[PDB]
Amino acid sequence: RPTFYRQELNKTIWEVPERYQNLSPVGSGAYGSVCAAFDTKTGLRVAVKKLSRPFQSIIHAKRTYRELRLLKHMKHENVIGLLDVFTPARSLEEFNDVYLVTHLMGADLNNICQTDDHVQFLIYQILRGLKYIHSADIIHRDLKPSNLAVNEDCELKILDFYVATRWYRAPEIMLNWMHYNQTVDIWSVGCIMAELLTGRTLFPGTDHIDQLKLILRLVGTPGAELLKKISSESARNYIQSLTQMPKMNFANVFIGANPLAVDLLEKMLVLDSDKRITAAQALAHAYFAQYHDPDDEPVADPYDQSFESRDLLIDEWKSLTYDEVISFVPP
Numbered sequence: 001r002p003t004f005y006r007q008e009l010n011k012t013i014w015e016v017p018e019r020y021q022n023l024s025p026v027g028s029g030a031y032g033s034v035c036a037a038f039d040t041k042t043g044l045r046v047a048v049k050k051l052s053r054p055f056q057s058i059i060h061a062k063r064t065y066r067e068l069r070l071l072k073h074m075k076h077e078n079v080i081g082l083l084d085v086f087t088p089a090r091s092l093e094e095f096n097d098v099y100l101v102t103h104l105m106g107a108d109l110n111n112i113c114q115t116d117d118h119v120q121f122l123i124y125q126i127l128r129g130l131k132y133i134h135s136a137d138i139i140h141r142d143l144k145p146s147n148l149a150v151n152e153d154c155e156l157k158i159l160d161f162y163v164a165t166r167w168y169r170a171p172e173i174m175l176n177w178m179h180y181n182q183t184v185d186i187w188s189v190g191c192i193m194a195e196l197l198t199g200r201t202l203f204p205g206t207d208h209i210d211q212l213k214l215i216l217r218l219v220g221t222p223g224a225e226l227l228k229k230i231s232s233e234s235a236r237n238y239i240q241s242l243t244q245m246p247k248m249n250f251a252n253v254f255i256g257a258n259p260l261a262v263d264l265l266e267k268m269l270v271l272d273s274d275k276r277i278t279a280a281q282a283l284a285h286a287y288f289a290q291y292h293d294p295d296d297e298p299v300a301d302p303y304d305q306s307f308e309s310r311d312l313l314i315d316e317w318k319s320l321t322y323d324e325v326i327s328f329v330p331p
């Protein structure tokens, strides 16, 4: 049981074991604050996240539990993994804060390591990690370049932490569809891969409405029947007021690109989420022929999400979270 020191960072009091030094605030939000640090015990650069009031509400406590459970379960080369989890509390009765620790990566996909081969390798790794995540019955929902970390040797890792999420969000989420499926993440991959191919953001909308119009300008406005699978009533009415836009031929948009990459993008960037390619299907596409290895593209061990159906109070989620903290074993 180590010694903690205190330091006021990100408008809050950080209490961390002395092994973590050189704390430097990275960013913050309503769901936590992140610092880069140096772990003197391993010699690693790490990221430390302090969850912001994790037990203020039932949903806060449940998602605190949800994140810790999820992260303790992820064992994949292309998904961020947990190096440590700690609390300064000495007992459940004073348990109020939770800290998570991962590797610090040298870069994200916005800031780059190294061609068509380099786009293939990066997108392959995203899809390899997504196949794993999706096999655990988890949807990322927030994929964007700043959530994709890359080390020196261009090994990529998916995480969840300017660069707007809206630029990469699936249209059915933008149109207020509540019942979307895992391929919302594939839409995001298509937008990311377009930007790696051309150098430019595919749909850099300045606002909610601008985003929809830029999307429809490329894929074409949907018919009424398609609208009812991807959109809520007020969004359907608005889309139906717009001039008809035809689908563009992606070959004239991604001029010069590998024709197999264009074919893959045509399968990713479709409005019909029942027609959109899955991560496992995309990994088998001929575009990735030089890296595709079904024996090295594993699924996840079964992930017990039955807690998602439990109706628990704040103190009950707090209690389960505490037990996940004190049972953690580092890799």
Ligand SMILES: Cc1cn(-c2cc(NC(=O)c3ccc(C)c(Nc4nccc(-c5cccnc5)n4)c3)cc(C(F)(F)F)c2)cn1
Binding pocket: 026, 034, 047, 048, 049, 063, 064, 066, 067, 070, 071, 074, 079, 080, 100, 101, 102, 103, 104, 105, 106, 107, 133, 138, 139, 140, 149, 158, 159, 160, 161
């Ligand atoms: C409520 C909820 C959360 N999630 C979920 C959480 C994470 N967490 C992290 O990635 C995470 C948690 C703690 C830490 C410390 C970090 N590390 C981190 N965070 C922000 C930035 C950086 C960073 C900064 C600079 C360079 N490299 C990394 N690292 C990640 C990851 C996923 C997924 F799907 F992507 F796997 C899902 C699901 N439901």
